[PDB]
Amino acid sequence: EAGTAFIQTQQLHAAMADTFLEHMCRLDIDSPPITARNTGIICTIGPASRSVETLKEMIKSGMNVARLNFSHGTHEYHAETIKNVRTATESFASDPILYRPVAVALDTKGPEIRTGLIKGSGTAEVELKKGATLKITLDNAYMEKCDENILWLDYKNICKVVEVGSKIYVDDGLISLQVKQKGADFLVTEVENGGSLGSKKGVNLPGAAVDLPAVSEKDIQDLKFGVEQDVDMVFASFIRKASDVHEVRKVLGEKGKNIKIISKIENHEGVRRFDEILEASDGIMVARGDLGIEIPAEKVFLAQKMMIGRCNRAGKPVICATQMLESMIKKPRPTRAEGSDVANAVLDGADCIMLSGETAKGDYPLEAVRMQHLIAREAEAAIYHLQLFEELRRLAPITSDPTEATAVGAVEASFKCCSGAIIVLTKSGRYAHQVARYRPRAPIIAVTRNPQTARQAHLYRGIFPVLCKDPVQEAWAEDVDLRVNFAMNVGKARGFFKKGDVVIVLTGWRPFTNTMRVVPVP
Template structure:
């Protein structure tokens, strides 16, 4: 039972600065509880206990009333990690606005316009197109459907979001051929059976229960006796018996379909190009279609990222390159990959085959941590809600997996087969949305912000300094949102780097910047269409008020709440240096 608060002020709620003696009980427990709702990272419990009179324990009244029963605020501002865990409460409400972006793979189950509309309303931020499958005509039609689906809800401020389109390259991967020459055929490989693995062009359509064709001519040269070949994300495992003609024993059997991925753990595939001829054609197609980002598969070093940028050419220079790390070599070269990339995807499917499964979580945490430290977006992907391909609810372990990716610091979480071919694509997005909201409320916010600030090198960049101050101020005044005006998206990315608890409403005139901002944790891009006002100060006010109206419509804050506004002092990009704390009119 909550103790009622006594207010000793006749001023309007939004104007009232403090609340005096909140209750007559003077137990240290009550004092400790009320201190949590200050949301002040520097507000120590020890300082509260040392206060000699109630006026020194004054707290913003609107903060107390607004956040008292919900959003795990007492836990998020704990003094220690153990105390943070002890204060988590299953009966508190989740965070108001989901900050983690959801990436959905679009396939046969989800490419229709009505289904895409449902997925956008359910929370899809980025649509991923897997170019390992499908023709350019197929993907061109899918892109058209995505844009039509988004356009139909443009006027609805509650559901509209500028959905980004990501092209996922085939990359330097190895795949099997079609079973008996057709995409619909499958074959059962029984445990203990012997099979031949062939690479000749004449055997391309010969895959059956005795022969498996793969598209890697150098296969006999890189294999060793006793080595392993894994097919279809490791569902089928072969042990190499002979390398001259590649005979193998089926150690773990299963159903083999066409065009399945092949992994050769421990093999050095130095002759495989970073960008294949097919990839170059796909990237040119993506540039022509105006995709917003590329998920570059099987990136092994920094040079591979540079090759992808070269293939994009001058017309694709503004496309974001997100490197998929899915091999041991990529993990070892992670820092140079990160330096060359706009973001990173922790692609756990192939990574879990290339390295021992029990070490995948170590690689995941390391990569997410280094991306957070560098201020670059990171995606956690593969088998997050895998059981929802066939079932309407995930397993408990899958729910915990998504939540832990959010707690680790992922900017985005990704759905693959769940939305591409599953029976419940919309339900999968809805479930992931709900899990992310609950997980974000349970983040140890005080520790996170302090560590991010401490690890950041000293900077004389006005934009970064302003971003740090804005995020800290958002904690101190319990802001409903940070509203930032951005031309290139850099200011929004710097704010996202320091992980404010409230949403970041990024107002921009650039459609591409708005879509690409979906990669960033906590950023809600808003597209401002009107032409600039003749007086620049008026134009700033117009954009700020537009962001406020959108924030109120989406329920981020209401009239009278405090928001932080971040702007520049002159027109153009690179001049962000003003932070204001204002009440929403």
């Protein structure tokens, strides 16, 4: 019983526009999105979020990957966080239809520069005033005696790499110092941007050639611990060149060879050497916190769109990270810039978006996860797939690989029939990755028996991993039918599609491979 104007869901009116300009003009706040949310959500776990009961709610709210930030915390602290993540995750395991795999990511400390402790207890702060003099010292006598006159930091070669006139940034680049005088193991600086300085804050030296290793001896100890803890992926801080990626990957040994290596790009050299880093990496993080201090803040969006574009072109995962919902550390709703930032990261093409302080330390971790979920789903509907899919095809080589032809044919078919899902049977993830790179509108239900595959799948836009727990059937066709039926039940239970809807099914490895069928949901 209509009346006047029935509004198409999923921005389908905008989807049909013949120009991008008209696509924008048709975006409709009254066009509700589909249930499925394709962009992966990565959450940094910390004091605000590491209890088992909070982690259960994080998972329910949409967290796909638990990020452990090894810039802070000792190994027993991280071991307990991982234990809690797994307790919370497996509390849902009794129902495989509804169980969500949750990945664990180790984010390295890497070649950070950090200050010491403010004198006293270390929890106080000192007010640095503009124009005042501040001495930076390497003398360890002051490593717990920092104040408004003398500042200790832990980079022993700093005096070599800076010069008179260079700028030094402290605490998220909020405090700035100008080097007036150099010394043996000290620098005399003048405070440019003042502010309140706490303990153990991050330091950046833009334009200085910092010579700390991408992977220090202590970083190796963290990586080995990560292998022992069976982490799914490493987010490697401050990657500057391809050989840095190899230092991360090779040291994990044979035991860690399946761990995904995500290079964090957060300095000027990583941007300049991006292509060789991307080639050596499994994926990329646009690590905007350090990046926006190392290069001018006004250039970060160029680097972000460049990297997301190149990762989309290569079919490798890319994460947009840092300060996406920053005000939600203290407030229950985001600023308008933060809502825009999350949406535009998805429209840019990010496979995943990330929360750091918002979930690690803030007062509203659940609300932050929920808001990334809501924004991502709205933005996914607004993507101009008509142009995106055409360009991804044109920028993708014609190869003789039959599996790539299957994947592009499946995504083409999914657009042609507006399918409710692409179901993919996958052991390693590869077949599902191949579909995701063409960025279908429809969700990808990736059925696997491999738990690590299920967890690592979250790196890719649109791959909804489901972990089949049933034994392998001796008859291959019976085993395929079992796994397809599992995916059909998942999609119906989660509201992705209904009986009678059309879906695409890719049946995976056969003892040709990955047959495609376009079927009504049984």
